[PDB]
């Protein structure tokens, strides 16, 4: 190669955006992907331009509270359809019995509780 | 007359070698050897 | 380390890292009774 | 010419800005730089392209990144880098060392003291070189004080503050200083280390602070040494009255904890208004218990124990001091923020510091120095000595010496002057400063950060002087300010015949708060060969946050009632994530003071600087290697050479807009 001396704009996934924007990118140039406010980045996330005018993309996704398991025996407080970050929920069962384990549950980042206890147990009896 | 197409070649890198009056870069082992070190001129002379 | 009677230290090396424990076994014909482990103390001594 | 300026050590997964400069021509030609691995032939990490024009004055800088494209496994994972330049007039290649050292790990624990069967709330702060969150996976390992590992835990970071599950103390704990290390667990470097001791913090009744009048006992303090013992409560109020029992002792080393002791006192003093002071003479102790009475014989620590009991109620608190050794040699001297180099004709400031035996500055000690200004060609003369005192608040003595233009090197012997320090037992440290050249050209930047340290937002002027250049007509001025091993900005100015020295204005930014460095290099056109001269000086400024995060409770009162509902208001400049931690003031055991949780965010961040020293040095290669850079040019090369109440509480992470307030 003479004793020394393109890929189009790559598409971005949902809730994501590319750090560098351009019409044509040279072969071998790498781009960095970012996520909007309220979402987290999981993946490489770098996409690489190949010699075949294609973009090599790894297993990358753009991820970010909801109602609990809602057992017929348990009661949530407060009872709201959507939960915001920073609020706590007091779950308990009917009278004469007390919830086993942690009494208060806190809303995490998103789709995240500290314990989940999906249909595990509320209370047998506390004698 | 001609039209320049390719850029002109720059001078070769004189790496860690004391340059002479002409441009022959030689090793620093000959510094202050009391003889014709550069072998072309006595430019350097190393205040020897 | 200096092994007990009958010696037979496995995976013999020149220097052992701090916190690494090496198990010692009894030489034939004998049998290991008790707690057979030598753990490297922070200083140059051994637990024994 | 084609001067390429690049950092000495590149960081993997980081934006490393690579600048290039051209000597100038009527034609505008493009340039291209790429990042290739050890195979020349055949691999390429990334390829950047720049554009040159008369508007940019034929200089440009493009950011480059090093991504995990390295070969998996192998005998060596790095194969650091090969750097090439693709330009119409020039093309050259050079290898450069790199390191996976990118980012920082700040492990924040809720408590320095833990009891058996207690939860361990800990969070790790992941960061990049550009101070970004840099969301990355992180593993956390625990090491027993005996040296054995305990447990490992991994967790993915989504917010930026790595939340970890509460660890549990085993049924059979091992008392001592534990160890906490954190790694990114796949391919990274810069392992963080945190320490915490497991002990019994059940109840400290009142903090007992031992503040002696003097740090270490000297000759004047041998006959009479007065020490102040003050005990104060944890709620900012002093102790009214308490009986204080003083116990003295002599220890050979800090490692030996048990030593014989008097056996003479047993001095009983009364605490008044939270402060007590007693006079203790060393002559009686060295005569009675030491078995030999002479200050030359005993060179070993002095252990003092203090037991304070309250006369109005049954309570006891103890404190201790490691030791005070009687040393014949006085305190040692060292230089800080002082380049050991010379600039001819320009006054060279000298900043020396005096430290005690154990890593602590000393104040109020007069010091003087003797200097000999030598000529480049022939005999020399003795420079007039100067004497000054060191301040207790600053801790560094200031000196200024003006030298002629024909001086090459200087040697200064800084010695201490005190009425008690004799001439035989004196502290003297000799040093040598070497000036900067084949083309006889020099360069200098002034004011040596003695402003003192500046803030962000105000413009600063710096005077440069091309003394004795190769030619009176200089093409342009080139200067580059760097920080954290990266080039944040590149400057450029023009040279006119209006004056001999020109002042350049450099705007300061928020990204340069911890530290910075600037280098000014100018190229000349020789009739046969070219030669460029550079120079650099440290840049110390203040520490101002970019987010401007301040915490303040809505109720404003000196004292709060127990159980009172309080509200905390956060105020930030931009959107940021907060990590609150309500740590008690009594959790700090004696433990040699239990210094602080972190106390260091910029001081530990300063480790990102590749080069060492303040600045200045030998020819361009040596000074660029000392500043942390590696240059590429035609002229010169670079040689590598249960309630109530347990602690702690309020372990939460919340999103904070410009103004956020929570209630608890």
From Swiss-Prot, chain A:
Reported modifications of this chain: C-, N- and O-glycosylated. O-glycosylated with core 1 or possibly core 8 glycans.
Superkingdom of source: Eukaryota
Annotated Sushi domain residues: 6-64, 65-124
Cellular localization per UniProt: Secreted; Target cell membrane
CCP 2: region residues: 52-127
CCP 1, as annotated region: 1-51
S-S bridge residues: 7-49, 35-62, 65-107, 93-122
Family statement drawn from the similarity comment of this UniProt entry: Belongs to the complement C6/C7/C8/C9 family.
Chain's role: Component of the membrane attack complex (MAC), a multiprotein complex activated by the complement cascade, which inserts into a target cell membrane and forms a pore, leading to target cell membrane rupture and cell lysis. The MAC is initiated by proteolytic cleavage of C5 into complement C5b in response to the classical, alternative, lectin and GZMK complement pathways. The complement pathways consist in a cascade of proteins that leads to phagocytosis and breakdown of pathogens and signaling that strengthens the adaptive immune system. C7 serves as a membrane anchor.
Disorder cited: Complement component 7 deficiency: A rare defect of the complement classical pathway associated with susceptibility to severe recurrent infections, predominantly by Neisseria gonorrhoeae or Neisseria meningitidis.
Subunit (UniProt): Monomer or dimer; as a C5b-7 complex it can also form multimeric rosettes. Component of the membrane attack complex (MAC), composed of complement C5b, C6, C7, C8A, C8B, C8G and multiple copies of the pore-forming subunit C9.
Name of the protein this chain belongs to: Complement component C7
UniProtKB/Swiss-Prot annotation, chain B:
Post-translational modification: C-, N- and O-glycosylated. O-glycosylated with core 1 or possibly core 8 glycans.
Residue stretches of biased makeup (Acidic residues): 37-48
Localization: Secreted; Target cell membrane
Disulphide connectivity of cysteines: 14-25, 20-38, 32-48
Span of domain LDL-receptor class A: 12-48
Function according to Swiss-Prot or TrEMBL: Component of the membrane attack complex (MAC), a multiprotein complex activated by the complement cascade, which inserts into a target cell membrane and forms a pore, leading to target cell membrane rupture and cell lysis. The MAC is initiated by proteolytic cleavage of C5 into complement C5b in response to the classical, alternative, lectin and GZMK complement pathways. The complement pathways consist in a cascade of proteins that leads to phagocytosis and breakdown of pathogens and signaling that strengthens the adaptive immune system. C7 serves as a membrane anchor.
Subunit-structure text: Monomer or dimer; as a C5b-7 complex it can also form multimeric rosettes. Component of the membrane attack complex (MAC), composed of complement C5b, C6, C7, C8A, C8B, C8G and multiple copies of the pore-forming subunit C9.
Family of this protein: Belongs to the complement C6/C7/C8/C9 family.
Disease tied to this entry: Complement component 7 deficiency: A rare defect of the complement classical pathway associated with susceptibility to severe recurrent infections, predominantly by Neisseria gonorrhoeae or Neisseria meningitidis.
Protein name: Complement component C7
Taxonomic source organism: Homo sapiens (Human)
Gene: C7
Curated annotation (Swiss-Prot), chain C:
Location of the protein in the cell: Secreted; Target cell membrane
Domain Sushi: 1-48
Superkingdom as given in the UniProt entry: Eukaryota
PTM text: All cysteine residues are assumed to be cross-linked to one another. Individual modules containing an even number of conserved cysteine residues are supposed to have disulfide linkages only within the same module.
Protein family membership: Belongs to the complement C6/C7/C8/C9 family.
Subunit: Component of the membrane attack complex (MAC), composed of complement C5b, C6, C7, C8A, C8B, C8G and multiple copies of the pore-forming subunit C9.
Function as written in the Swiss-Prot or TrEMBL entry: Component of the membrane attack complex (MAC), a multiprotein complex activated by the complement cascade, which inserts into a target cell membrane and forms a pore, leading to target cell membrane rupture and cell lysis. The MAC is initiated by proteolytic cleavage of C5 into complement C5b in response to the classical, alternative, lectin and GZMK complement pathways. The complement pathways consist in a cascade of proteins that leads to phagocytosis and breakdown of pathogens and signaling that strengthens the adaptive immune system.
Name of the featured protein: Complement component C6
Organism per entry: Homo sapiens (Human)
Species lineage: Eukaryota, Metazoa, Chordata, Craniata, Vertebrata
Portion of the full-length sequence here: 647 to 694 of 934
Swiss-Prot record, chain D:
Highest taxon of the lineage: Eukaryota
Annotated spans, Involved in the tick complement inhibitor CirpT1: 379-405
The name this protein goes by in its record: Complement C5 beta chain
Organism: Homo sapiens (Human)
Residues of the full protein shown: 22 to 788 of 1676
């Amino acid at each position: 190669l003479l004793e020394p001396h393109f890929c189009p704009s790559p598409p971005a996934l949902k809730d994501g955006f590319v750090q560098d924007e351009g019409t044509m990118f040279p072969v071998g140039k790498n781009v960095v992907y970012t996520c909007n406010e309220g979402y987290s980045l999981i993946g490489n996330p770098v996409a690489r331009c190949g010699e075949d005018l294609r973009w090599l993309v790894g297993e990358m996704h753009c991820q970010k509270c909801v109602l609990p398991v809602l057992m017929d025996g348990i009661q949530s407080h407060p009872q709201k359809p959507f939960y915001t970050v920073g609020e706590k929920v007091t779950v308990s069962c009917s009278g004469g019995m007390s919830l086993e384990g942690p009494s208060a549950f806190l809303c995490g980042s998103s789709l995240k509780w500290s314990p989940e206890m999906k249909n595990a147990r509320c209370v047998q009896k506390e004698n | 007359s001609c039209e320049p197409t390719r850029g002109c070649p720059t001078e070769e890198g004189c790496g860690e070698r004391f340059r002479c009056f002409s441009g022959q870069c030689i090793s620093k082992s000959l510094v202050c050897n009391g003889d014709s070190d550069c072998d072309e001129d006595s430019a350097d002379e190393d205040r020897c | 380390p200096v092994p007990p009677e009958n010696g037979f230290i496995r995976n013999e090396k020149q220097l052992y890292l701090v916190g690494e424990d090496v198990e010692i076994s009894c030489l034939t014909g004998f049998e290991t009774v008790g707690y057979q482990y030598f753990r490297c103390l922070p200083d140059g001594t051994w637990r024994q | 010419t084609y001067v390429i300026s690049a950092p000495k050590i590149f960081r993997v997964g980081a934006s490393e800005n690579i600048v290039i400069q051209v000597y100038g021509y009527t034609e505008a030609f493009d340039a291209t730089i790429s990042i290739k691995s050890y195979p020349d032939k055949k691999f390429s990490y990334s390829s950047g392209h720049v554009h040159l024009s008369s508007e940019n004055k034929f200089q440009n800088s493009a950011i480059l990144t090093i991504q995990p494209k390295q070969l998996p496994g192998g005998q060596n994972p790095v194969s650091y880098v090969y750097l090439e330049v693709v330009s119409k007039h020039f093309s050259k290649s050079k290898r450069m060392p790199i390191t996976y050292d990118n980012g920082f790990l700040f492990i924040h624990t809720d408590k320095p003291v833990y009891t058996p069967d207690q939860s361990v709330k800990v969070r790790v702060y992941s960061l990049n070189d550009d101070l970004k969150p840099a969301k990355r996976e992180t593993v956390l390992t625990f090491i027993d004080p005996e040296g054995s590992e305990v447990d490992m835990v991994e967790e993915i970071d989504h917010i930026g503050i790595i939340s970890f599950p509460d660890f549990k103390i085993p049924s059979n704990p091992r008392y001592g200083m534990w160890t906490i290390k954190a790694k990114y667990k796949e391919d990274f470097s810069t392992t963080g280390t945190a320490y915490f001791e497991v002990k019994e913090y059940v109840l400290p009744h009142f903090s007992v602070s031992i503040e002696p009048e003097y740090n270490f006992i000297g000759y004047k303090n041998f006959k009479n040494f007065e020490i102040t013992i003050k005990a104060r409560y944890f709620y900012n109020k002093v102790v009214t009255e308490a009986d204080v029992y003083i116990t003295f002792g002599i220890r050979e080393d800090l490692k030996d904890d048990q030593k014989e002791m008097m056996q003479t006192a047993m001095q009983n003093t009364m605490l008044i208004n939270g402060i007590a002071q007693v006079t203790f003479d060393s002559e009686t102790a060295v005569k009675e218990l030491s078995y030999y009475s002479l200050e030359d014989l005993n060179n070993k620590y002095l252990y003092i124990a203090v037991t304070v009991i309250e006369s109005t109620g049954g309570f006891s608190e103890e404190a201790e001091i490691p030791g005070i050794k009687y040393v014949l040699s006085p305190y040692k001297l060292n230089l800080v923020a002082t380049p050991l180099f010379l600039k001819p004709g320009i006054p060279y400031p000298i900043k020396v510091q005096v430290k005690d035996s154990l890593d602590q500055l000393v104040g109020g000690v007069p010091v003087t120095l003797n200097a000999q200004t030598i000529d480049v060609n022939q005999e020399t003369s003795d420079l007039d000595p100067s004497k000054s005192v060191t301040r207790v608040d600053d801790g560094v003595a200031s000196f200024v010496l003006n030298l002629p233009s024909g001086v090459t090197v200087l040697e200064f012997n800084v010695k201490t002057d005190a009425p008690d320090l004799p001439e035989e037992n004196q502290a003297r440290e000799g040093y040598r400063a070497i000036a900067y050249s084949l083309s006889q050209s020099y360069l200098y930047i002034d004011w040596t950060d003695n402003h003192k340290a500046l803030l962000v937002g105000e413009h600063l002027n710096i005077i440069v002087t091309p003394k004795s250049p190769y030619i009176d007509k200089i093409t342009h001025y080139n200067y580059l300010i760097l920080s954290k091993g990266k080039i944040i900005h590149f400057g450029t100015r023009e040279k006119f015949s209006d004056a001999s020295y020109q002042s350049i204005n450099i705007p300061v930014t928020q990204n340069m708060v911890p530290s910075s460095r600037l280098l000014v290099y100018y190229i000349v056109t020789g009739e046969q060969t070219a030669e460029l001269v550079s120079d650099s000086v440290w840049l110390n400024i203040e520490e101002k946050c970019g987010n401007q995060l301040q915490v303040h409770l809505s109720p404003d009162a000196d004292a709060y009632s127990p159980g009172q509902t309080v509200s905390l208001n956060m105020a930030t400049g931009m959107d940021s994530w907060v990590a609150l931690a309500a740590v008690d003031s009594a959790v700090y055991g004696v433990q040699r003071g239990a210094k602080k949780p972190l106390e260091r965010v910029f001081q530990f961040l300063e480790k990102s600087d590749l080069g060492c020293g303040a600045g200045g040095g030998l020819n361009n290669a040596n000074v660029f290697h000392l500043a942390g850079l590696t240059f590429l040019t035609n002229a010169n090369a670079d040689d590598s050479q249960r309630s109530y109440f347990p602690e702690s509480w309020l372990w939460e992470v919340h999103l904070v807009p410009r103004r956020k307030q929570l209630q608890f």
